[PDB]
Amino acid sequence: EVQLQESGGGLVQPGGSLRLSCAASGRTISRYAMSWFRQAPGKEREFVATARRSGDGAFYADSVQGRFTVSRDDAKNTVYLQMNSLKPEDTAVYYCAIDSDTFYSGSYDYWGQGTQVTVS
């Protein structure tokens, strides 16, 4: 079925920028909202951003509003999280997930394995 693969993470200085990619294989994802989540070690997983279907917009967590931007490359079956103005508090494993519900209720059935982001 679908496999999700995150990339683009790594070590970055405070104030720096990274672009995460979430590439989907096995199934076309242009009909589904794609979300970004993050989890620091031993903390709760938290929502970061969602890119709904092209034309339906994007929504953001308060912690990243004005700094991170979600976008889609539907032809390459991929979505992105552009992360500017990175802060120590942003360090975490970052995950992408498909919302399997086309009406956007947040049925997150498929997840990537994650990619580490370290700001320091």
């Binding site: 917009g57 929504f59 308060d62 997930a97 209720s105 947040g106």
Partner: protein
């Protein structure tokens, strides 16, 4: 009859944004297309007639374009007061004058996951033949959410109704109630009552449950 197809159903945008609402006629209506605004609990208000003529008294941030079959209403700078339903209307073919099905325009905010609460039926209600089990999803954004009822781990279908509040004017969130209605007899056959909630702000569904009589 000319059918009017209006899109999107729910337009979520930020103050200052340029927004557009579309209205496609099923056959040509020339420039005989009107646009109305309806605030919650208010009367329709004419914004645009003849496809692009701005009605007197309506702010200049409202404009309409189009001819024939394809029309758009643009708010070039969304303001707080523009939260409302919007309707297109053709008058070329009469009878009947027809309307689009409506667009709700709302002001976007950051994501807030619902807080969930489950409430069992009261002894008082049960004495009388019916059991109402209530699940509350409180203070969340965006509006889309899914509630699933499970009774002794069996998923329920067809015996629930939902009601949603209007977007809160202070904090821009929604709340939602899902009520599961059973006969008292059916309610008393089971032990565990669970309300399972999904929202795009939740990484895993949130389940609240009670054990009957405990």
């Amino acid at each position: 009859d000319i059918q009017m197809t209006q899109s999107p159903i729910l337009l979520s945008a930020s103050v200052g944004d340029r927004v557009t609402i579309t209205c496609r006629a099923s056959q040509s209506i020339r420039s005989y297309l009107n646009w109305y605004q309806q605030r919650t609990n208010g009367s329709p208000r004419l914004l645009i007639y003849a496809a692009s003529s701005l009605q007197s008294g309506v702010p200049s941030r409202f404009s309409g374009s189009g001819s024939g079959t394809d029309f758009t209403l643009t708010i070039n700078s969304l303001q707080p007061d523009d939260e409302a339903d919007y309707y297109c209307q053709q008058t070329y073919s009469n009878p009947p004058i027809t309307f689009g099905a409506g667009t709700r325009l709302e002001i976007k905010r950051t994501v807030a996951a619902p807080s969930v609460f489950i409430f069992p039926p009261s002894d008082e209600q049960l004495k009388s033949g019916t059991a109402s089990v209530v699940c509350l999803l409180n203070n969340f954004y965006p509006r889309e959410a899914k509630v699933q009822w499970k009774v002794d781990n069996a998923l329920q279908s067809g015996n629930s109704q939902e009601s949603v509040t209007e977007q809160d004017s202070k904090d821009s969130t929604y709340s939602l109630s899902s009520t599961l209605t059973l006969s008292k007899a059916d309610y008393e056959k089971h032990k565990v009552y669970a309300c399972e909630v999904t929202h795009q702000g939740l990484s895993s569904p949130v389940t609240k449950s009670f054990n009957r009589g405990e």
